[model samples]
Target: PAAAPGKNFDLSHWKLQLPDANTTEISSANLGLGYTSQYFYTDTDGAMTFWAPTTGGTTACSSYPRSELREMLDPSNSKVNWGWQGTHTMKLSGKTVQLPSSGKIIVAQIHGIMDDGTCAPPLVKAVFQDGQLDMQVKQNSDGTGSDVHNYFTGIKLGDLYNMEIRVTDGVAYVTMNGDTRSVDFVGKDAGWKNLKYYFKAGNYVQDNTSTGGSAIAKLYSLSVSHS
Candidate 1:
């Protein structure tokens, strides 16, 4: 049996969503304490590992599958997430070891949720597909206009990567291995100010067909803080 990922990473305020037909969820109480399965575990190197097949089930809004982390400030409640007004940061280091048929997987994200706990277009999607990293940010708060997609150089599959994603004073700063890019996410759009936000990391495979295969991702270290 593999060790629980919590032993290697701090999951105190994070919950897990598994890629199963039922889309089962693991509470922070279980994750912070101890929990492991075929989809989430600690590898031999002690890196947190995630494995998800393309055939796995999905959440209501999306058709893709994921074995991902959902950040929570209050471990007992889902609605108690964060917002865009404060300084929130997520520091993570990892890499995608394997890819699905589409060769695409989202490794991290800054997701938005309304005060009513409904979905909004995510603010950022850090995708690792094959040999490059794509940083996608929404341009408008109401989900209008085209997303700004930026690609960074030198990142290939199986290569270790370090990332620092932060939102402070309405600006979103994304850094990958020291190359940084900043976006005025909320300043230009007033509607974004009303939405709550949470950080997410893990393997969110972009394909969802029987022939699409699966994906695997590893996180050597991960932590998040909000002020």
Candidate 2:
């Protein structure tokens, strides 16, 4: 048996979202006990890996395919997430192994989830595509809002980079390879205060067409801390 990603990294507070027929999600209780599937496993380099096929089964609210991990402070319940007021931080060192046909993959995301079990647009996304890394920040909490694309070039496929996504007092700071970018996640939008958030990391393929290949990413390390 291959080494599970849990055996290589600390997944004590994270749950796995798979790209299966049902888009099965694994609990954090099972993840830390050494869970691994074809979509989420350890690669030859021993780096915790993920493979999200563009044509894989989709989740209810998401159109893209992902073999990602969602932050969960409590494994028993999904509702116990963090708010936007405190300092919530997620850090990872990873690199994109392969991109889908669209040449786009979201490596990490600060997804906005409503307290009442509704959905909001992601607060920010660390996207690797077209030989560069882009931090897409949402201007509005609603779905129809546009993203403020902050581009940082010089990263190609297979190049390793360290990233940090930090949310403090309604502001978002996404840092990659020592270059940092900041955005006020909450501006004039009063509704943003009602949304909770969590961190996500892995290969989220931007394309869903059959012709679009899979997106792959390898993470050497990952961690989340809130205060």
Superposing all C-alpha atoms, what RMSD in Å does each candidate have to the true structure?
1.1, 1.2
lDDT, candidate 2, 1-227, per-residue tens: 77798877888888999888899999877887889887988888889988988889888778888999988888777777888788999999999988988999899998988887576678888989867899998888876758888889988888999999998888889898998988886764757788888999998889999999898898998999897
Displacement of the residue 47 alpha carbon in candidate 1, Å: 0.7
Task: List the candidate 1 regions with Cα displacement exceeding 4 Å.
Answer: none
- Name the lDDT of candidate 2: 0.86
Q: How far off is residue 47 in model 2, in Å?
A: 0.6
**Number of clashes in every candidate structure?**
0, 0
Which stretches of candidate 2 lie above 4 Å from their native place? Answer: none
Reference-based lDDT, each prediction: 0.89, 0.86
TM-score of each: 0.97, 0.96
**Residue 26 displacement (Å), model 2:** 1.0
Error of 1 at 123 (Å): 0.8
Candidate closest to the true structure, highest lDDT: 1
